[PDB]
Each structure stands twice: as C-alpha cells, then as structure tokens.
Write a protein that binds this ligand. Structure first.
Ligand SMILES: N#CSCCOc1ccc(Oc2ccccc2)cc1
Ligand SMILES: [Mg+2]
Length: 284
C-alpha cells in the first residue's frame, strides 16, 4: 500500500463509520470512482463535525483554507492546516476530475450558519438547508458518477442529495430534538398542530403522524423522479445509485414499523440491504 492508498483508506473508514447504508452501495463502484467518493464524503463529514473540535470555528476555517489552496493551486504541494490525509486525497481527486468548489463553500457556509440555528419559518427554508448540507454534496459527486455532466446531471444529483437529507431528518427526529434541533418548519408544525417537545414526552399521535407522512411523501416523490432520470449517470453508477436510494427509502418503512419512535434510531439490516441489491441487479 502506498501513502495515497493510506489516505484513501482513512477516507473510507470515516465514510463507513458514519453511514453503513451509503458505504454499502458506494463501495460497489469501480476502484477509481469509489476512492473519489470516499474522499469527497470524508471532506464533507469533517466539515459537518468541525465545530465540536474545540467548540468553535477554528478548524472549519482551516478546512476552508485547505480547499481554497487546492482550488487555486491543484498541482502545488500544500502543507494542509486541517486533516492532511483527507486533503491529500481530495487534491488527488481534483487533479483528475472537475470539482465544484463553490459547492464545498456553500456547504461550509451552511455549517457556519448552524451555530446560530433558529428553526425554519417555512418549508422553503428547510429545503434551502437540505440543499446546503446535502444538495451541495450531490453536486460535488456529479462528475465522479457521470461521464458527460450536463445541467440535468447536476439537477438530478442535487435532488437525490436533498431527498436523502430529508430522509435523515425523518429518521432522526428524536435524536435531533435531544440535541436541541428541530428541522420541521414552523409553518408546517403550526398547521398540523404538532409540538415536538410534547411528542417527545408523550409519544406519537395522529397529528404527528400526518405531519411526518407529509414530508415522507415529498421524499418519496422526489425519489421516484430521480429514478425516472437515472440514465444521466454512468452505466456503472446507475445500479449503485439506485441501490443507495432504495436503501434510504426502506428507512422510511423502518420508521413506520417502529411506530415513528422518537427514542431510538431505526436502521436497515445489512441482510435487507443485500436483498435490495439482488432485486435491483436482477434488472441490470
Ligand atoms: N448520510 C446521509 S445524507 C447524505 C448527504 O450528502 C450526500 C448526498 C447525496 C449522496 O448521494 C448522492 C449521489 C449522487 C448525487 C447526489 C447524492 C451522498 C451523500
Ligand atoms: Mg438530521
């Protein structure tokens, strides 16, 4: 194993530790493409977790500066200020693929904003957030997973990213609430007569289920529209991206099955993931 192999292996570790679902699917990609996905994912994870390093923006500022050095001098040697292993891997990717750097900056700006989080007034603000933390990631991944990127390719990837984010939110209501985060909009909470603190204390009720299902319907419709447009992606990536998406859709059924519980994180069994993969490959 070379030094760069070690860098990418560390990126893989970070990705698998954070999301088994995502890892399961994307580990099926060809070698060059899988490694690029690991590096991009890891950078994004590092940005997402940055604030809790010392409890301020110091590390996040360093990450941003590392990315800016890569963008402006992709072929110069850099002494990276943040996580060297991850930044060397990203630089290696950048030398071979067109990285949407403004997408990383959008993600970083979103993370900056999150330290003075206030609840979203409307669903438009919530969807803006889903773009910020997840749509941006889809945009960065676009050139890795497609051969000739058009505005359509980016559009579809962006939509998938945002659907996944919404599904994460739908899975993590209780956990987010404990961490003083509520992502459902105030508009929608008021309309459905829902109070998350109340529900966390007293269990689900029909108002909450209706509110939850309202958003779940959005995720599922977005999912189907992405499925209809799967051919913008390279032939190798299509089954993989379809797998990722299906595994996440199944997360919604896992929640319904646990009766929308706010007190544990539901999940799709590894064996169930293998089943979805079989069902999908059968038609590939
Ligand atoms: N965990 C979690 S929530 C994920 C948030 O960041 C993303 C977003 C999308 C994604 O897969 C995509 C593949 C192609 C295009 C767009 C997305 C992987 C990670
Ligand atoms: Mg969440």
């Amino acid at each position: 194993m070379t030094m760069m192999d070690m860098n990418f292996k560390y990126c893989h570790k970070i990705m698998k530790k954070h999301s088994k679902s995502f890892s399961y699917a994307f580990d099926l990609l060809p070698e060059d493409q899988r490694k690029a996905v690991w590096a991009i994912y890891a950078v994004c994870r590092k940005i997402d977790d940055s604030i809790d390093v010392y409890g301020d923006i110091q590390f996040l500022n360093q990450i941003k500066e590392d990315i800016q050095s890569i963008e402006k001098y992709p072929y110069e040697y850099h002494h990276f200020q943040s996580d060297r292993r991850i930044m060397m891997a990203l630089q290696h990717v950048a030398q071979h693929k067109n990285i949407a750097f403004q997408s990383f900056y959008n993600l970083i700006d979103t993370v900056y904003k999150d330290q003075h989080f206030t609840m979203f007034e409307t669903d438009a603000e919530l969807f803006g957030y889903c773009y910020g933390v997840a749509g941006t990631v889809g945009e960065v991944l676009t050139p890795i997973l497609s051969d000739h990127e058009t505005h359509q390719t980016y559009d579809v990837a962006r939509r998938l990213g945002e659907s996944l984010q919404l599904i994460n939110i739908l899975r993590d209501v209780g956990e987010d609430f404990e961490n003083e985060r509520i992502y459902f909009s105030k508009q929608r909470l008021k309309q459905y007569e829902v109070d998350i603190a109340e529900v966390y204390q007293n269990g689900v009720n029909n108002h909450y289920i209706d509110l939850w299902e309202y958003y779940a319907a959005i995720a599922e419709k977005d999912f189907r529209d992405v499925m209809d447009q799967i051919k913008v992606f390279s032939i190798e990536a299509q089954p993989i991206i379809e797998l990722a998406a299906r595994i996440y859709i199944e997360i919604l059924d896992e929640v319904r099955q646990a009766n929308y519980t706010l007190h544990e994180r539901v999940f799709v069994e590894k064996r169930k993931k293998a089943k979805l993969f079989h069902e999908i490959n059968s038609k590939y």
